[PDB]
Nucleic acid binder design. Structure first.
Lengths: 555, 411
DNA sequence: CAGTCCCTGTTCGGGCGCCG
DNA sequence: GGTCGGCGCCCGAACAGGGACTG
C-alpha cells in the first residue's frame, strides 16, 4: 500500500480495552450488490485491504441511499468501537451563517467527493477497523477488509478530517491572506475582492494545491456563477435566502409530525420574521408515544395558519457590512414569546430570530427581555464578533427603575428606546416606606403536613380580621393565601406585614406572570392598588399582630 | 538545556475538558498575533484533535494598559493539580505583607516562558482559538513552557525565583516579597517616593535575568464594615420592627444580642406609621446591643486548611458590601465598596471590579483566592464578565438569588 | 437536635430540524 | 435506513440545595 501525502493522526484505544468483535447484520440482497460494488472499487484504489484470520476483530456494516443520486454511501456501525476508542476534541465549534459573510467581488463554491476516503488512517489503528461483507449466499464466508482511510461512521472521522483539512489550507492561506476561505467539512466557500481575472487563477491554484495531497475538486460540484448553493442557502451577489422549506400537510397529526413541523419552523425563524411555536409546542407536553395521534387545538390551528401565510411571501437577508453599526430590535410577540431582527440599514435584515424560554415559575417581561438581549448578544458575537446596538420596547425610565432597585446584578448594553407597542413596563411598584393613613395588615398562614389542612388570615390596626379554612394546601400556599386576602379586603393603599420569606421573595421580584394561579391572583390585586408596602418580621417573637394572627391560624 | 520538573495530576482524575466560549473580534485578533509570535519563539506548538483536553482562552487589558494580555482559565486544571502546589512545593505566606504602608504588584508572567514544561503534562495545557462566524475550525495549541495562570508554574520557578531575589533581599531585609500566580507583591513601610524608587531597582534587577508594571496598594488603610444600628430620635412601629428583625438576624453572629424588651413595644396591633416611645428598658437594650456590635466576634480565626468564601450584596446607589468567611457567621473580614468604575450605569462592571478588589485583599491577607457567591444570574454574568476583567488570575464563583430580607450590612 | 416535605432551579437526556 | 460529528429548540426526569417544622 502506497503512502498518502497527508500526515496521519495517531489514534489510540482507551487503555484496558480490546477491539470490537460483533457479528454482521443480515443484509438485503440489494444492499449486498451495492456494497460489493463499492468494496471492490475502494480496494483497487488502495482504500481498503484484504485481511485474513489473523485479524480477530469485526464490526457490522450497512449502506443507505444518497440524496438525489443512484450512488450509495458506505457506513460502518462502529458503536462498539466508539465506546473503546480514545476521546477526541471536536474542532467544529459551530455553524457558519450567511449573515456574517462580507460582500466580495467574486465567489466560488466547490465540494470534494469521498473526502473521508482521501485522508489516511493511523497505521497501528487499521487493525480495529475490520468488517465483514456478506455475500449473496449465506454459506459463503465473505470478504473481510480493513480501512486505510477515514471510515464513515467512526466517531473520530469528522474530527480528524476537519483538522487535517485545515493543515492543508494553512500554506495557501498564509501565501494568500486576502482570500477568504470558509471551511466546513467537505465544502469550501472561496471569495475575494480581487478582479474576476485573478480570481480563477487563485481558484485553479487551490484546486492544484489540494490535488497535491490527494483531494480532488471535481468540475461537477464546481460553482462559478450565482446563485451558489452553500450550507443549504441560496447566495446571490446582494441577498441570500434559505433553500425552499416544505411543511407537512397531515390531516391526522402525530407527535412525530408535530416535532418535525416545529423543527422546520425553528429553521425558518432565522429569516422569516414572526414565527410562533408556542401553541404547537404545547402539544408535545406530557405525551409519551412518538406515533400517538394528537388533535390540533384551536390555538394551535391558528398558529399554524399564520406560519403558513408567512412562508408564502419571499423573504431574503443581506450581508454584513463592517463599516456601519450593528442594530438589533426586539418586539414582544406573545405571552412568553419574543422576536428580533438584526440589521444595519432599515428593513434590510441580516437575520431574524426568536426567544421564548420560560425560566422560572415566576417572572416578568423585564426579566424575559434581559434574557433575550443576552441570547442575541451571544449570537451576535458568534457571527459578527461584536455587540449590536439595541432598540428595545422599554422606556428608559422603566429600565432605570428596574435595575437600580433589583437586588441582583442586571445590565443591558448600549440601547435606545423604540415606541413600538406593546411596551414592556412594570405593572406595580412596591413602596419603600410605610404608607401613612393606610390600614396595616398583619398576615400569617399555617398548615398541617399530614391533614393537608390549614388556615390563613390577617389582623389589622382598625380591628378588621378574617380567618379562612383551607383544604389540600401547604405551609407556603397558606402564607401566600393570607397576603391575597389582605389585598382583597383592603383599600387602594395598604401596608402588609408578613413573616414568610417565601411569599416576600416572590412578590418583591415584581412578576407579572406565574405558573401558579394563586400568584397570578395576587399580581392582579397588586395592579389594582395605588400604594402597597410590604414588610417582613421574624415569626414567633411576639411582634405586633403577627403573633396574634400566628395563634389564630395555628391549627 | 534545562531539566524538566515532573508533574502529575491528582490520583483518579483526568485533564480539563472545558469548551471554548465565543470571543469578540478585538480579542481574536489579539490572540492570533500573540499565539503566532509565541509559536515563533517556541513557547507553544500546534496540536490536533487526538488531544481530548482543552481550556478556555481570552484576552484582557490591565488597568490603564494598552497592550493585550493572553489569559487562560486554568481553574479546572488547577483543581486537578492541587496536591502539587500545596504539599510538595508550597510557598509560605508572610503575615507582615498586610501591615505595610504600600504594596505593589508586578506581572512576572513573562519569566515562566524560560523554563520548559514536563513533556507528559503538556497534554493538559491544550486550548483552542475560535474564529468569527466559524470561518475555520478551532486552531489548537499546547504550552511547551511554564504556562501563565497555572498554579504549578510559580512552584517550579520558586527555586529559581529565590536565587534572583536573594541579592535584593539581602540589600533590603525589611522589604517583604510574596509570589502568587503570575504576580509579585512587594510591600514596604518606606515613604511613597523612595518606595517607587526601590520598585524600579527591582524592575532593573529582574531585567538583567531575562524578564514592567505599576499597581499600588495600601493595606494599612483597609477598613471593615461593622453592623450598625440607626440613631433615630423618633421610632415608629415599622422602625422598631425592622430593628428587631435586623437584631434577630445579627444574633446568629453575636450571641449576646437580645430583643426581649424591644419586642415588648410591639405588643399591640398598631399601625406601622404610628410613633412609639422607647421605654427605659428598651433604650438600655438598644445601647447594649450597639456596644456588642463594636466587640469582635468570639472564636473567629483563620484556618489554612479551609477554603475561603465571599458573599457580595448589592445595596444600590453604587454601594456594595462583602463578607469573607470559612465557617458560616464566623466572618474573617467585612467591608463595603463604593463609587467604583461603572457606578450608576453598570452593575456587571461594578461586580467585576468588586470581585477583583476582594480577591486582591484575600491574596494579601491569607494568600488564597476565595470562592464567590455572586448576586447575579449565570447567564447575565457569563455574558459580560470578560469585558471588564483586568486581572491575571480568576477566582471560582457560584450564583445565588437570596432576596433581601432586612439589610444587615448596610443602613 | 437530624429528617423530612415544599419549593424552585439547574442539568441532562431524549426527541425533532438543519449541515457536511 | 436505524453511522458519525457539529448546531439549535422543547419537554420531562432526575438531581440539588435552601427554608420551615417536628421526634
Amino acid at each position: 500500500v502506497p503512502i498518502s501525502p497527508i500526515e496521519t493522526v495517531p489514534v489510540k484505544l482507551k487503555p484496558g480495552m480490546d477491539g470490537p468483535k460483533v457479528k454482521q447484520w443480515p443484509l438485503t440482497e440489494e444492499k449486498i450488490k451495492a456494497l460489493v460494488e463499492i468494496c471492490t472499487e475502494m480496494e483497487k484504489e488502495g482504500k481498503i485491504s484484504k485481511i485474513g484470520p489473523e485479524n480477530p476483530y469485526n464490526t457490522p456494516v450497512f449502506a443507505i441511499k444518497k440524496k438525489d443520486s443512484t450512488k450509495w454511501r458506505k457506513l460502518v456501525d462502529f458503536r462498539e468501537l466508539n465506546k473503546r476508542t480514545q476521546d477526541f476534541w471536536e474542532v467544529q465549534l459551530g455553524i457558519p451563517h450567511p449573515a456574517g459573510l462580507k460582500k466580495k467581488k467574486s465567489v466560488t463554491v466547490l465540494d470534494v467527493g469521498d473526502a473521508y476516503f482521501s485522508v489516511p488512517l493511523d497505521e497501528d489503528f487499521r487493525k480495529y477497523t475490520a468488517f465483514t461483507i456478506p455475500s449473496i449466499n449465506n454459506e459463503t464466508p465473505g470478504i473481510r477488509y480493513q480501512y486505510n482511510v477515514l471510515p464513515q461512521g467512526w466517531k473520530g472521522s469528522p474530527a480528524i478530517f476537519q483538522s487535517s483539512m485545515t493543515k492543508i489550507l494553512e500554506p495557501f492561506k498564509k501565501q494568500n491572506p486576502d482570500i477568504v476561505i470558509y471551511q466546513y467539512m467537505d465544502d469550501l466557500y472561496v471569495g475575494s475582492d480581487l478582479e474576476i481575472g485573478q480570481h480563477r487563477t487563485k481558484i485553479e491554484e487551490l484546486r492544484q494545491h489540494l490535488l497535491r495531497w490527494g483531494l480532488t475538486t471535481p468540475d461537477k460540484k464546481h460553482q462559478k456563477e450565482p446563485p451558489f448553493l452553500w450550507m443549504g442557502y441560496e447566495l446571490h451577489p446582494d441577498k441570500w435566502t434559505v433553500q425552499p422549506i416544505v411543511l407537512p400537510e397531515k390531516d391526522s397529526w402525530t407527535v412525530n409530525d408535530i416535532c418535525k413541523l416545529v423543527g422546520k419552523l425553528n429553521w425558518a425563524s432565522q429569516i422569516y420574521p414572526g414565527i410562533k411555536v408556542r401553541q404547537l409546542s404545547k402539544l408535545l407536553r406530557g405525551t409519551k408515544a412518538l406515533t400517538e395521534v394528537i388533535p390540533l387545538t384551536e390555538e394551535a390551528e391558528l398558529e399554524l395558519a399564520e406560519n403558513r401565510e408567512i412562508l408564502k411571501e419571499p423573504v431574503h437577508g443581506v450581508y454584513y457590512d463592517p463599516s456601519k453599526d450593528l442594530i438589533a430590535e426586539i418586539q414582544k410577540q406573545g405571552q412568553g414569546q419574543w422576536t428580533y431582527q438584526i440589521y444595519q440599514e432599515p428593513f434590510k435584515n441580516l437575520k431574524t430570530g426568536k426567544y421564548a424560554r420560560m425560566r422560572g415559575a415566576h417572572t416578568n417581561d423585564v426579566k424575559q427581555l434581559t434574557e433575550a438581549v443576552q441570547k442575541i448578544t451571544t449570537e451576535s458575537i458568534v457571527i459578527w464578533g461584536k455587540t449590536p446596538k439595541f432598540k428595545l420596547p422599554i422606556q428608559k425610565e422603566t429600565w432605570e427603575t428596574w435595575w437600580t432597585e433589583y437586588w441582583q446584578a442586571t445590565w443591558i448594553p448600549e440601547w435606545e428606546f423604540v415606541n413600538t407597542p406593546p411596551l414592556v413596563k412594570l405593572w406595580y411598584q412596591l413602596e419603600k416606606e410605610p404608607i401613612v393613613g393606610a390600614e396595616t395588615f398583619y398576615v400569617d398562614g399555617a398548615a398541617n403536613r399530614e391533614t393537608k389542612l390549614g388556615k390563613a388570615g390577617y389582623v389589622t390596626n382598625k380591628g378588621r380580621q378574617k380567618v379562612v379554612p383551607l383544604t389540600n394546601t401547604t405551609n407556603q400556599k397558606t402564607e401566600l393565601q393570607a397576603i391575597y386576602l389582605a389585598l382583597q379586603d383592603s383599600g387602594l393603599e395598604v401596608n402588609i406585614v408578613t413573616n414568610s420569606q417565601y411569599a416576600l421573595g416572590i412578590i418583591q421580584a415584581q412578576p407579572d406572570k406565574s405558573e401558579s394561579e394563586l400568584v397570578n391572583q395576587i399580581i392582579e390585586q397588586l395592579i389594582k392598588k395605588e400604594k402597597v408596602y410590604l414588610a417582613w418580621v421574624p415569626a414567633h417573637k411576639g411582634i405586633g399582630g403577627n403573633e396574634q394572627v400566628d395563634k389564630l391560624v395555628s391549627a | 538545556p534545562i531539566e524538566t520538573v515532573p508533574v502529575k495530576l491528582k490520583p483518579g482524575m483526568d485533564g480539563p475538558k472545558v469548551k471554548q466560549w465565543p470571543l469578540t473580534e478585538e480579542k481574536i485578533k489579539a490572540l492570533v498575533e500573540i499565539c503566532t509570535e509565541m509559536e515563533k519563539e517556541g513557547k507553544i506548538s500546534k496540536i490536533g484533535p487526538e488531544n481530548p483536553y482543552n481550556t478556555p482562552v481570552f484576552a484582557i487589558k490591565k488597568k490603564d494598559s494598552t497592550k493585550w494580555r493572553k489569559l487562560v482559565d486554568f481553574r479546572e486544571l488547577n483543581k486537578r493539580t492541587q496536591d502539587f502546589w500545596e504539599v510538595q512545593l508550597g510557598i509560605p505566606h508572610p503575615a507582615g505583607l498586610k501591615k505595610k504602608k504600600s504594596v505593589t504588584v508586578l506581572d512576572v508572567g513573562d519569566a515562566y516562558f524560560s523554563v520548559p514544561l514536563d513533556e507528559d503534562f503538556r497534554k493538559y495545557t491544550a486550548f483552542t482559538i475560535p474564529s468569527i462566524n466559524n470561518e475555520t475550525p478551532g486552531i489548537r495549541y499546547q504550552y511547551n513552557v511554564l504556562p501563565q495562570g497555572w498554579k504549578g508554574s510559580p512552584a517550579i520557578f520558586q527555586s529559581s525565583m529565590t536565587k534572583i531575589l536573594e541579592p535584593f533581599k539581602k540589600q533590603n531585609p525589611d522589604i517583604v516579597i510574596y509570589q502568587y500566580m503570575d504576580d509579585l507583591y512587594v510591600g514596604s513601610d518606606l515613604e511613597i517616593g523612595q518606595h517607587r524608587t526601590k520598585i524600579e531597582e527591582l524592575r532593573q534587577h529582574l531585567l538583567r535575568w531575562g524578564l514592567w508594571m505599576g499597581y499600588e496598594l495600601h493595606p494599612d488603610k483597609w477598613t471593615v464594615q461593622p453592623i450598625v444600628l440607626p440613631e433615630k430620635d423618633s421610632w415608629t412601629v415599622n422602625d422598631i420592627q425592622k430593628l428587631v428583625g435586623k437584631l434577630n438576624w445579627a444574633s446568629q453572629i453575636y450571641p449576646g444580642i437580645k430583643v426581649r424588651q424591644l419586642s415588648k413595644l410591639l405588643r399591640g396591633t398598631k399601625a406601622l406609621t404610628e410613633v412609639i416611645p422607647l421605654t427605659e428598658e428598651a433604650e438600655l437594650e438598644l445601647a447594649e446591643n450597639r456596644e456588642i456590635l463594636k466587640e469582635p466576634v468570639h472564636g473567629v480565626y483563620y484556618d489554612p486548611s479551609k477554603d475561603l468564601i465571599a458573599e457580595i450584596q448589592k445595596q444600590g446607589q453604587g454601594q456594595w458590601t462583602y463578607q469573607i468567611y470559612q465557617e458560616p457567621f464566623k466572618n474573617l473580614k467585612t467591608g463595603k465598596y463604593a463609587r467604583m468604575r461603572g457606578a450608576h450605569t453598570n452593575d456587571v462592571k461594578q461586580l467585576t471590579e468588586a470581585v477583583q478588589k476582594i480577591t486582591t485583599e484575600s491574596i494579601v491577607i491569607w494568600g488564597k483566592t476565595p470562592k464567590f457567591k455572586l448576586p447575579i444570574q449565570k447567564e447575565t454574568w457569563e455574558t459580560w464578565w470578560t469585558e471588564y476583567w483586568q486581572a491575571t488570575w480568576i477566582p471560582e464563583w457560584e450564583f445565588v438569588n437570596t432576596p433581601p430580607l432586612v439589610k444587615l450590612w448596610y443602613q
